[PDB]
Nucleic acid binder design. Structure first.
Ligand SMILES: [Mg+2]
Ligand SMILES: [Zn+2]
Ligand SMILES: [Zn+2]
Lengths: 1327, 75, 49, 99
DNA sequence: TCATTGAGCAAATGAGCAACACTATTCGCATATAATGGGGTTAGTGACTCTTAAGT
DNA sequence: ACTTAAGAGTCATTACCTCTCCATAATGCGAATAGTGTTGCTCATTTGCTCAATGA
RNA sequence: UGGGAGAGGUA
């Protein structure tokens, strides 16, 4: 019951006969006169144990006094009836048949072991063609598949020397006669002479398979089923119906088929049947056994009586309704309720209203215990009936029991971890669970008919989890990003916006008040409104250096509503918290500031009090919607008429025949977009500032008190797009073919649409409703795949002591700041120092958690980039340390050791899937004759650094682009500095002089033609695919020389100044002219959720970018073929590398320059596998994080980058070995990177050479399947393939995963169970 | 300890260690019937043990040496 | 009789009438379901149909 | 709908599903991941064993809750034994190797 | 001299066995003009990956 | 000696509620075995009752 | 009582 490992292997026939208790020899299950089970049947009592507790079948032994005996009359062993689901039988098959798993699950393992094709093995098993096992003559070798005619020829020819059998018994004899170590040694010799790619891969597959058999100790004859085991008859039960008829399982039908055909084969072998009949019966038994093991696998699936295919054993375990994903991971659970949810705003943050009857049904054994303790019930039956009669003493005892006993409120689908929270229940009269209004932003639940499950923790440990870890006052901050999710939502927000907004001359403006209490007294007496601009006295408490609170008291120019909220805001916050109009972002910043200053308990009472006052003043407001409140702008018809006249003008121009149809289409869309923007701007102007009728200074202007604008500007419900569709113009609606329709829906939802506009709108409405369903399914599939990769990651160590890290620069692509340094680095731990003078000389040491104060210091001193320790670079085996991960985002401090990171990271990523001066760097340039500077590099980036040192923008310039500004020059804004040729790629030079037209002749490499505009001849270099026989061995060169003709050298190198230009070049420069330096010479021409799923599944795209694998210069080596090879030789050593590039793809790097490690040779998207293998682990981590965050910022969802780094670290777990030392890794075996790190640590400890490696970015599906745990892999996906590979290789499970301990039934090593698991681990180590 | 277990968390240093220490204290109050050092004020044993940790009487090593003292006084 | 009772009793289109009010009766009789014997499924149906 | 302790299934011996047959609410795969994210290992263990398919553990839990002592007597569930017997009936030797 | 403890005993009832005699079930066996190659799917999937095979 | 097509395989969210529906065909005749009834008999269990020491 | 299909509906 306390086992360390779950070892899986193949089953010998002796082991199957050791499992069984009796041979099942009859197909009939039970009788019909009296329903006792038969003898040697499918339900038999002698084989599968007794039917009743401690009773035989005849009734002789009938008590526990005879504890365990065998009945001499009927054979039924007197035991408990629990052994009807623990005892197996066995069927003794006449002809030994083949297992369908180890034959049809590709790779077949029988074709891979015997080295025979699967079609020929299937022909042998189908009794269509003989196979020869052994033969003494040289005519018939081993495994020569003969036909019937060839066997009848060989029988009359030799008849005595060879032995050829047909069927599965022949394959059993073949696997018996083969020799595992002899074939392994012969293939090890065969691998060494020559290495073709397909032959070496097939040979190493077979060698890995044979070495798996020898090291696991299995035998190859065990794949042929001779003895078939039988499931116990309470696991293939016989359940009745309500009308006397029986409804059995499909396994009883399949077992009846196998037993009947096996008994008929025994009868046909005893009756001396003909060869055709006994061969067909052997084939039928093979088909029946294969159907029972996997129905839908071999051929046509055997259907039952109701025309549906039967459920086999492989269909019971594998699938969506299989044993794993329906009963092992997620089980049904007692002590559980379910009801509709309503709103309780009178509650606190940690309370929920359970009904009386539902909680009486929930807490029933607890009421039994308190009834028998207080002496009000003698026995359990009396207590049962006192609860069932619902007495007043039962209600009082229930009120005592339910006090301080938290229950979990679950709501499906539980996307993120805040979908389960523990609440102290309060008994109410009703039938609906009254939630708090604040937690329904965490639950994503509105009250339109939702339903929530109520689970009751029983034990004291479970009540303490629900009180310390899962209480609703503890998880305020979201674990995705460190922002509070217990936030006012739409109604508190409308009330607080109406409070802290101010009018101009409302009622009682310009008084002086003794404080917040007198302001509240003035409003509730009625002498002053909520919008009177008044001077109040405010006594705010600032924070000292220690925990003391100093005070200041002055007069502030406030409103009455802000002076009412100052009674609510606790001591410790400034007045600039309250002194603005509070939208949803403003109240979020209020709760965040109150958290970081005060803690948790002032934050909880502030949220409850701000919700109470928000609800109360939204009720006192009366903020109603009306038909006079959706104010249509009075200049809508004029703009619409002008736009229709302009569209009709371009239409009649097209009907005259001047402008084409596509340009008319693009012009009409651009005109209607401009018209829609103008109407929306006029609508927003006339709705924001319509309130102008004022007094007490003059006719003044202010923001409007319109309720539609109020519930838009507050961030409560809706946005400016929704207000535009209500009041302005509906806009341009799209067809389901993607193309935007030309005429738009001009009417809004106030004037009412006509028939055709509504029928056009139904396209997008049904499309959006259809799209939403698809993304949720995709997001849940993505969330399951992400969780099943990141299962095995937990915090183990407190610190690993590494020196690596990822330098976090703010993402500065384009013209704006996407993420600031504060959002990028707040929470992580600094790897190195910050070495810059700056203004204050900030020097944070290593191993420092970056708090908000340290990040404020970084913002003040304006640091460009800081290097912090990431999860990917952590050097801890089987788990990460706390200092590399950094801050527990749900709490706000450093992460406790033992808490599972990866499940939180996978949930936080897959939850919004249902919502989806001039600075020059890396340059090589030369000053031209005019100062218009040109760049001779491709990887040049143009950085835009401010005068303080920080970076403002970023731009990448092309190679050969012109530039007017040098380094250190500060140009003003709006100046166009980026000037470049977009379609042509120049071939510019850096030296001056004359040109020598060498190695180009008119006729075989260049085309003699002229330009059609100027009359000058132009020498276009002809491409090598259309050249003649004279141009297959030459490369034309623009031999730039000096003014008289000597070969000028490049300054710095020893390469001659040559320029091998490619084809299709517009050579305008002729011989005998003067050429400057830096001038041109010739012209050479050129979703959200699927993108996230393709980044995480690590897919090679449709057009990968060719990169340079070794640093050095590049030259061409192979001629007379269009596949351009690059002999990229290094500048120090020899070249062992070449590269094959197809015909039509263009090249960016010419054959005269030198590339670094990982240079873009061919443009396009770059594949993440070669990104890793060439650039580095930190580079592929930064690529995946940036390209995922681009999607999540496009849609507007905040997600911290540490979660994406956790998924990347779980993707990079494998590491193939390129060269071994003295370790037990021979060649190309994809072992885990933690295993080779431990092996290299041991080898460098005892002083040896060590073994190098090379990591590889596996996808999510391939990583979770190549996880070393067969139980985790089979619970995720592909149960047939995972169990087949584990059974052949003889693997074992060490029980170290969270999913593994969910399946087995132990405490997970995640959080509270981590102490128990490390105690068990040290107990196993110390003994 | 009724509404928030925050000061008990800052006293212990670990949420999961707090759950384990309060579970052993609540097991000693439910099984053995030991004397709670705080006034119970008609609360449950979970909140009583959490209040004892909130004051600062119960720690892992302190409850272990107290259990060792009772064991060595039994012998 | 076995074939016509199977169609009229246990087909995929001969379904239980939602008759909780007259509007549900009249909109269950004016219904054109593209599924059934010889039609689509909820797996073989994209955004085209 | 609510359920304290009623009828149980026959193949897996975990409680039934449905208001008409007095069923228990399903604690699905998403909720198992939420408890793993919380770190409530004791709540996860007592929701997979003693509130579910483990007859000896749930009977001792019922007697202990009635007798006042809220203690946990865990054990291996029976769906895992169903899984072991089904793989062994497929013909693949899987065993719980002791130590 | 009598209540209290220690030990046992005939008798009534519940359980059951052993051998034998009648009887309702169940299974092996026989039908003699001639009869000599079958139904039944899935049909408006999508995307991706792995293996095998003709093509270059 | 390597590179594109054909074919097979494997997934495509969670939780709950209601309803209906889940089959028909050869006869007969002894032989033999399992089942049930019958009568005489033994054995384990419990209970009111009896008998023998012993101090008050 | 428990099992399996088909249809409908709610979030
Ligand atoms: Mg809802
Ligand atoms: Zn018996
Ligand atoms: Zn680390």
């Amino acid at each position: 019951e306390e086992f360390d490992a779950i070892k899986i292997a193949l089953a010998s026939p002796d082991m199957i006969r050791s499992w069984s208790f009796g041979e099942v020899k009859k197909p009939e299950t039970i009788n019909y006169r009296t329903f006792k089970p038969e003898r040697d049947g499918l339900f038999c009592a002698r084989i599968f144990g007794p039917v009743k507790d401690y009773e035989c079948l005849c009734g002789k032994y009938k008590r526990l006094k005879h504890r365990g005996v065998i009945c001499e009359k009927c054979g039924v062993e007197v035991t408990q009836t629990k052994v009807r689901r623990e005892r197996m039988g066995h069927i003794e098959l006449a002809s030994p048949t083949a297992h369908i798993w180890f034959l049809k699950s590709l790779p077949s393992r029988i074709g891979l072991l015997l080295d025979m094709p699967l079609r020929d093995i299937e022909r042998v098993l189908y009794f269509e063609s003989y196979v020869v096992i052994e033969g003494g003559m040289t005519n018939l070798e081993r495994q020569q598949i003969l036909t019937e005619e060839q066997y009848l020829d060989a029988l009359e020819e030799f008849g005595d020397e060879f032995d050829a059998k047909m069927g599965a018994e022949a394959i059993q004899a073949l696997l018996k006669s083969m020799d595992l170590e002899q074939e392994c040694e012969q293939l090890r010799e065969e691998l060494n002479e020559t290495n073709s790619e397909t032959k070496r891969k097939k040979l190493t597959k077979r060698i890995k398979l044979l070495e798996a058999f020898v090291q696991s100790g299995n035998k190859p004859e065990w794949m042929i089923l001779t003895v078939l085991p039988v499931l116990p008859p309470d696991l293939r039960p016989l359940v009745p119906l309500d009308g006397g008829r029986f409804a059995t399982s499909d396994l009883n039908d399949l077992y009846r088929r196998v037993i009947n055909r096996n008994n008929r084969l025994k009868r046909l072998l005893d009756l001396a049947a003909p060869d055709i009949i006994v061969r067909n019966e052997k084939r039928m038994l093979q088909e029946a056994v294969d159907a029972l093991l996997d129905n839908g696998r071999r051929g046509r699936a055997i259907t039952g009586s109701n025309k549906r295919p039967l459920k086999s054993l492989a269909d019971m375990i594998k699938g969506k309704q299989g044993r794993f994903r329906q009963n092992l991971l997620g089980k049904r659970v007692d002590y559980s309720g379910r009801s509709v949810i309503t709103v309780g705003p009178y509650l606190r943050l940690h309370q929920c209203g359970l009904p009386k009857k539902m909680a009486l049904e929930l807490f029933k054994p607890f009421i039994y215990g308190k009834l028998e303790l207080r002496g009000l019930a003698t026995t359990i039956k009396a207590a049962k009936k006192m609860v069932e009669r619902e007495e007043a003493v039962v209600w009082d005892i229930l009120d005592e029991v339910i006090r301080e006993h938290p229950v979990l409120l679950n709501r499906a689908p539980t996307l993120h971890r805040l979908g389960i929270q523990a609440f102290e229940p309060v008994l109410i009269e009703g039938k609906a669970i009254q939630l708090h209004p604040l937690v329904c932003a965490a639950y994503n639940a509105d009250f339109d008919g939702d339903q929530m499950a109520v689970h009751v923790p029983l034990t004291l440990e479970a009540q303490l989890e629900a009180r310390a870890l899962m209480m609703s006052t503890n998880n305020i901050l979201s674990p995705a990003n460190g922002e509070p999710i217990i936030v006012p939502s739409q109604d508190v927000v409308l009330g607080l916006y109406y409070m802290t907004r101010d009018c101009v001359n409302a009622k009682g403006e310009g008084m002086v008040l003794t404080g917040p209490k007198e302001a509240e007294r003035l409003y509730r007496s009625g002498l002053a409104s909520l919008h009177a601009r008044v001077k109040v006295r405010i006594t705010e408490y600032e924070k000292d250096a220690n925990g003391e609170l100093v005070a200041k008291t002055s007069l502030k120019d406030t409103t009455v509503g802000r002076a009412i909220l100052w009674m609510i805001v606790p001591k410790g916050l400034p007045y600039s918290i309250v002194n603005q109009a509070l939208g949803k972002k403003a109240i979020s910043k209020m709760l965040n500031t109150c958290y970081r200053i005060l803690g948790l308990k002032p934050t909880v009472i502030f949220a409850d009090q701000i919700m109470y006052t928000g609800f109360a003043y939204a009720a006192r407001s009366g903020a109603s919607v009306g038909i006079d409140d959706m104010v249509i702008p009075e200049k809508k018809h004029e703009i619409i008429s002008e736009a229709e006249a302009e569209v009709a003008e371009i239409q009649e121009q097209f009907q005259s025949g001047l402008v084409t149809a596509g340009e008319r289409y693009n012009k009409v869309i651009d005109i209607w977009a401009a018209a829609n923007d103008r109407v929306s701007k006029a609508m927003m102007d006339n709705l924001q500032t319509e309130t102008v009728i004022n007094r007490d200074g003059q006719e003044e202007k202010q923001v409007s008190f319109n309720s539609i604008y109020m519930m838009a500007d507050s961030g409560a419900r809706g946005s400016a797009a929704q207000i535009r569709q209500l009041a302005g113009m509906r806009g341009l609606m799209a067809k389901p073919d993607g193309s935007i329709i030309e005429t738009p829906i001009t009417a809004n939802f106030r004037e009412g649409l006509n028939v055709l506009q509504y029928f056009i709108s139904t396209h997008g409405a049904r499309k959006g409703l259809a799209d939403t369903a698809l993304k949720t399914a995709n997001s849940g599939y993505l969330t399951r795949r992400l969780v099943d990769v990141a299962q095995d990651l937990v915090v183990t160590e407190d610190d690993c002591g590494t020196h690596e890290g990822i330098m976090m620069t703010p993402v500065i692509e384009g013209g704006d700041v996407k993420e600031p340094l504060r959002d990028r680095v707040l929470g992580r731990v600094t790897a190195e120092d910050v070495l810059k003078p700056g203004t204050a000389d900030i020097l944070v040491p290593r191993n420092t958690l970056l708090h908000e104060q340290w990040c404020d210091l970084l913002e003040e001193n304006s640091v460009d980039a800081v290097k912090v320790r990431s999860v990917v670079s952590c050097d801890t085996d089987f788990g990460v340390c706390a200092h590399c991960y950094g801050r527990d985002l749900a709490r706000g401090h450093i992460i406790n050791k033992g808490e599972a990171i990866g499940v939180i990271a996978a949930q936080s990523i897959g939850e919004p899937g249902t919502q989806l001066s001039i600075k020059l760097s890396n340059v090589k340039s030369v000053v031209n004759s005019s100062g218009k500077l040109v760049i001779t590099s491709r990887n040049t980036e143009l950085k835009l650094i401010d005068e303080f040192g920080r970076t403002k923008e970023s731009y990448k310039v092309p190679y050969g682009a012109v530039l007017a500004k040098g380094d250190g020059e500060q140009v003003a804004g709006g100046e166009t500095v980026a000037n470049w040729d977009p379609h042509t790629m120049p071939v510019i030079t850096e030296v001056s002089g004359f040109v020598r037209f060498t190695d180009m002749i008119d006729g075989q490499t260049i085309t003699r033609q002229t330009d059609e505009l100027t009359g000058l001849s132009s020498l276009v270099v002809l491409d090598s695919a259309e050249r003649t026989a004279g141009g297959k061995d030459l490369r034309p060169a623009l031999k730039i020389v000096d003014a008289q003709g000597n070969d000028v050298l490049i300054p710095g190198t020893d390469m001659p100044a040559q320029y091998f230009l490619p084809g299709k070049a517009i050579v305008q420069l002729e011989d005998g002219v003067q050429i400057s330096s830096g001038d041109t010479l010739a012209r050479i021409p050129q979703g959200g959720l699927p993108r996230v799923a393709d980044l995480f599944e690590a897919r090679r795209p449709k057009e990968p970018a060719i990169l340079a694998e070794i640093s050095g210069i590049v030259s061409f080596g192979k001629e007379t073929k269009g596949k351009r090879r690059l002999v990229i030789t290094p500048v120090d050593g020899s070249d062992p590398y070449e590269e094959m590039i197809p015909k039509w793809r263009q090249l960016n790097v010419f054959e005269g320059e030198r590339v670094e490690r990982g240079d873009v040779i061919s443009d396009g998207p770059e594949a993440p596998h070669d990104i890793l293998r060439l650039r580095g682990v930190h580079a592929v981590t930064r690529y995946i994080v940036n390209e995922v965050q681009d999607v999540y910022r496009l849609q507007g969802v905040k997600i911290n980058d540490k979660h994406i780094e956790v998924i990347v670290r779980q993707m990079l777990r494998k590491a193939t070995i390129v060269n071994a030392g003295s370790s037990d890794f021979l060649e190309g075996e994809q072992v885990e990177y933690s295993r080779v790190k431990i092996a290299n640590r041991e080898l460098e400890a005892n002083g040896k050479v060590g073994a190098t490696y090379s990591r590889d970015l596996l996808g999510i599906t391939k990583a979770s399947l190549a996880t070393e745990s067969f139980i985790s892999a089979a619970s995720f996906q592909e149960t047939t393939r995972v169990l087949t590979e584990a059974a052949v290789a003889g693997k074992r499970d060490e029980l170290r995963g969270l999913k593994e301990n969910v399946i087995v039934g132990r405490l997970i090593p995640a959080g509270t169970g981590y102490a128990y698991h490390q105690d068990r681990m040290r107990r196993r180590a110390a003994g | 300890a009724r509404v928030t277990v925050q000061d008990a968390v800052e006293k212990i240093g670990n949420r999961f260690d707090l759950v384990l220490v309060a579970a052993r204290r609540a097991r000693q109050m439910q099984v053995g019937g030991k004397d709670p050092l705080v006034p119970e004020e008609n609360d449950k044993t979970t909140v009583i043990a959490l209040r004892e940790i909130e004051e600062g009487l119960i720690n892992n090593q302190i409850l272990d040496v107290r259990e060792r003292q009772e064991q060595q006084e039994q012998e | 009789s076995a074939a016509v009772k199977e169609f009229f009793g246990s087909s995929q289109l001969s379904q239980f009438m939602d008759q909780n009010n007259p509007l549900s009766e009249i909109t269950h009789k004016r219904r054109i379901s593209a599924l059934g014997p010889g039609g689509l499924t909820r797996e073989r149906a994209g955004f085209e149909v | 709908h609510a359920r304290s302790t009623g009828s149980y299934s026959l193949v897996t011996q975990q409680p039934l599903g449905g208001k008409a047959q007095f069923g228990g609410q399903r604690f699905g795969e998403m909720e198992v991941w939420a408890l793993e994210a919380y770190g409530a290992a004791y709540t996860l263990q007592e929701m997979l064993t003693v509130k579910s398919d483990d007859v000896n553990g749930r009977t001792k839990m019922y007697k202990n809750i009635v007798d006042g002592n809220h203690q946990m007597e865990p054990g291996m569930p029976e769906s895992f034994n169903v899984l072991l017997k089904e793989i062994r009936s497929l013909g693949i030797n899987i065993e719980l190797e002791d130590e």
